[PDB]
Structure 1
Amino acid sequence: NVFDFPDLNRFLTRTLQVLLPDLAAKASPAASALIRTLGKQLNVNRREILINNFKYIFSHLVCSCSKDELERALHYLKNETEIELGSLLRQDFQGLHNELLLRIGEHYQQVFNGLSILASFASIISPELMADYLQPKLLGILAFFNMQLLSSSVGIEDKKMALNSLMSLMKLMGPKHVSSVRVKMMTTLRTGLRFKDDFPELCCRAWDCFVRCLDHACLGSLLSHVIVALLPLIHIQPKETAAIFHYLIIENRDAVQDFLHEIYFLPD
């Protein structure tokens, strides 16, 4: 009522997406009773609601919890859902990894541990091994990030967090994975530009990564759209856009032999 949600059950619908993770983080018998109460109010079973919100549940768990408490809550949730937690996580093949890569910008190391537990159940802390275990999901993960940037349900602060997470993810992917996913990465960076009305330098750093950290050879087939998109960012502010353009032009000039002349649109 203080928030004036349309329906109290709609307020519960919105709030649960984050409350269920904290309810599991408490892992108390009172928490189980409260989950049953919510399922009654939402007219759903206490076992299925947990399996459904397990994405955000495990996400917040790996985001903030202790390993012993993590295992405690895992066993508690398995018993409450009446199914093996490993099987549920298997049923959550990509949705969980999505939220993990969304929370990486907040807790790099915590989500590194979570992905290590993501890979242990998927069958592991080496960064290259982690990237290779995540290299398959990339396109789908990029699509999830893009949809998150697109959704009106998430705030602009959540969008900035997702952008930072995407920056860290592009850093972790390495030049091979980045070069492989360049097209979808460029689509998602265009989405970031579409949202860059308020977080300009954030998207600018994202582009600095997608340019400098990106492959050095195959720059120009993509440098076309890179300049086309960065055109709006320069007008907002030129501080880092100038350095981005310099790295694109000056540094990779030899590998920008023809694509340089191909790009005749340039601001002042």
Structure 2
Amino acid sequence: SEIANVFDFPDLNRFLTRTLQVLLPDLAAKASPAASALIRTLGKQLNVNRREILINNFKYIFSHLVCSCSKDELERALHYLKNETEIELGSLLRQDFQGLHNELLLRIGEHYQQVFNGLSILASFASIISPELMADYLQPKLLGILAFFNMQLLSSSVGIEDKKMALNSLMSLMKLMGPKHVSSVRVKMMTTLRTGLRFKDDFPELCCRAWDCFVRCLDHACLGSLLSHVIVALLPLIHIQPKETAAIFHYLIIENRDAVQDFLHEIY
């Protein structure tokens, strides 16, 4: 209620949910009977089982832990949580390991290695240390990952700067994909580029490099359509910074000049 008096929220319970989202990772880190007691108190006030509450976030919890946690500490915390929840922590993963991959990939840019370990553990449950095996694993999950990115974009609650970080992660992901998969996901890549274009004057400065990738990361043989879209989007981007756009253009124009033939014809 105090934090509420500082944060002025209409209904104290929705404000409590706001708090609880952040609280849950903290509780996970604790993995102590007293932490379970705090959670039980919150749920008692919440009217929702603290067990089921801990459950609901277990998915986000895994991601943020794997990113920032001690592996051994991770397993200890997971078992502690499971016992209270009455659900095996592993059994819950069997239901949302794909969403976990989505999360990690979201944070993959900054926690590349933690993403590795998590996705590997999940692949084991599915049926990885090698980068190519990690990729093969990611390929089926990344469509839903993109879906999650767009879902976040839709939500007002989600932060936009967070979308920017995720966009950087997406540059990393385009790199990791390789041409075979970048071909399949080119459309969604251009879609994400659009989305980011929606937010400007902060997203432009990173999204320019994002687009440089988007072009090069995209397969060399065909770039006309995406270049149409890109010149379109970039003309506005130029006003923010003239040079990044031009660099993106030049990569296509010269590096893909043989393809750029009749592509120029495309857009005057």
Normalising to structure 1: TM-score of the pair?
Answer: 0.93
User: Cα distance, 1:199 vs. partner?
Assistant: 2.2
Deviates more, 1:21-30 or 1:112-121: 112-121
Residues 18 and 57, structure 1, Cα contact 8 Å, conserved in 2: no
- Name whichever structure is richer in helix by fraction: 2
2:234 alignment partner, one of 230, 236, 239: 230
User: Cα distance, 1:149 vs. partner?
Assistant: 2.8
Q: What whole-Å deviation, never above 9, does each CA across 1:172-220 have from its counterpart, x for those lacking one?
A: 2222211111011111111011123422111111111101121101211
Secondary structure, counterpart of 2:110 in structure 1 = coil
Distance 1:122 1:192 in 2: 33
Q: What whole-Å deviation, never above 9, does each CA across 1:115-143 have from its counterpart, x for those lacking one?
A: 11221222221111111101012221111
Distance 1:33 1:262 in 2: 65
Q: What whole-Å deviation, never above 9, does each CA across 1:18-63 have from its counterpart, x for those lacking one?
A: 2212211111111111111111111111221122111211111111
Residues 192 and 203, structure 1, Cα contact 8 Å, conserved in 2: yes
User: Cα distance, 1:251 vs. partner?
Assistant: 1.0
Q: What whole-Å deviation, never above 9, does each CA across 1:80-121 have from its counterpart, x for those lacking one?
A: 211122210111143222211111122122212221122122
Distance 1:85 1:232 in 2: 48
Residues 102 and 142, structure 2, Cα contact 8 Å, conserved in 1: no
What's the RMSD between the two structures over aligned residues? 1.5
Residues 62 and 113, structure 1, Cα contact 8 Å, conserved in 2: yes
User: Cα distance, 1:242 vs. partner?
Assistant: 1.2
Distance 2:109 2:11 in 1: 33
Distance 1:178 1:103 in 2: 19
Distance 2:125 2:248 in 1: 40
From the superposition, tell whether residues 93 and 112 of structure 1 become closer, same or farther in structure 2 (CA, over 3 Å): closer
User: Cα distance, 1:233 vs. partner?
Assistant: 0.9
Distance 2:264 2:185 in 1: 23
Secondary structure, counterpart of 2:189 in structure 1 = helix
User: Cα distance, 1:147 vs. partner?
Assistant: 2.2
Q: Which consecutive segments of 4 or more residues in structure 1 shift more than 3 A?
A: none
Q: Which runs of 5+ in 1 are unaligned?
A: none
User: Cα distance, 1:144 vs. partner?
Assistant: 0.8
Instruction: Tell me the equivalent position of 1:98.
Output: 102
Distance 2:70 2:115 in 1: 13
From the superposition, tell whether residues 195 and 118 of structure 1 become closer, same or farther in structure 2 (CA, over 3 Å): farther
Residues 150 and 191, structure 1, Cα contact 8 Å, conserved in 2: no
Instruction: Tell me the equivalent position of 1:18.
Output: 22
Deviates more, 1:6-15 or 1:53-62: 6-15
